[PDB]
């Protein structure tokens, strides 16, 4: 399973905040102009329209992937080991070959 890493939005009040590339898998980043977000106590920014939210997200391997993962294998050239019981007279014995 993948983990999707989504930081807090970098809301730049009264300004702008250009995005930049990163090497992380499936990484997406976009800057959205003209945001005017609210928090519980009021508007987050003074400027009514000169704000930009930088949204960033990328994919990472899940925190349990060490423990819950499936292995894709190529499988070929099988070797056969057999356990045989040999007996005759006094001898009666089991050997792997």
């Amino acid at each position: 399973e993948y983990k999707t890493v989504v930081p807090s939005p970098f809301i730049k009040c009264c300004g702008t905040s250009e995005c930049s590339s990163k090497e992380q898998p499936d990484y997406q980043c976009k800057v959205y102009t003209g945001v005017y977000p609210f928090m519980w106590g009021g508007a987050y920014c003074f400027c009514d329209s000169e704000n930009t939210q930088l949204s960033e997200a990328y994919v990472d391997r899940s925190d349990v992937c060490k423990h819950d993962h499936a292995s894709a294998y190529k499988a070929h050239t099988a070797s056969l080991k057999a356990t045989i019981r040999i007996s005759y007279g006094t001898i009666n014995q089991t050997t792997e070959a």
């Binding site: 976009k30 959205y32 949204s55 994919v59 894709a72």
Partner: protein
């Protein structure tokens, strides 16, 4: 491919490099709301886990019993095994006996 087994792939459990193709796309935040909204195709591994069906242990021919660690097919009732037998004279009894 997204939403199918191996939408993320890693050459080993520990590897630093991850291929990811999950179709992660960001979208613009709703007016006055802080939430970094986004769509992404659900985990192809977590689809596989329910789409699996019963494993090869229930389906292998010749009555094989399949096991892991190591991958092996036990007791496959197929073919025949030549034997070369070098028996010493001390195993037999003489015709006089």
């Amino acid at each position: 491919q997204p939403g199918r087994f191996g939408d993320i792939q890693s050459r080993t459990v520990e590897s630093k490099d991850l291929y990811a193709n999950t179709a992660l796309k960001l979208s613009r935040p709703s007016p006055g709301v802080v939430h970094v909204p986004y769509t992404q195709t659900p985990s192809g591994f977590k689809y596989w886990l329910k789409e699996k069906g019963s494993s090869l242990n229930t389906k292998a021919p010749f009555g094989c019993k399949i096991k892991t660690n190591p991958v092996r097919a036990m007791d496959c009732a197929v073919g025949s095994i030549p034997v070369s037998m070098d028996i010493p004279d001390s195993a037999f009894t003489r015709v006089v006996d």
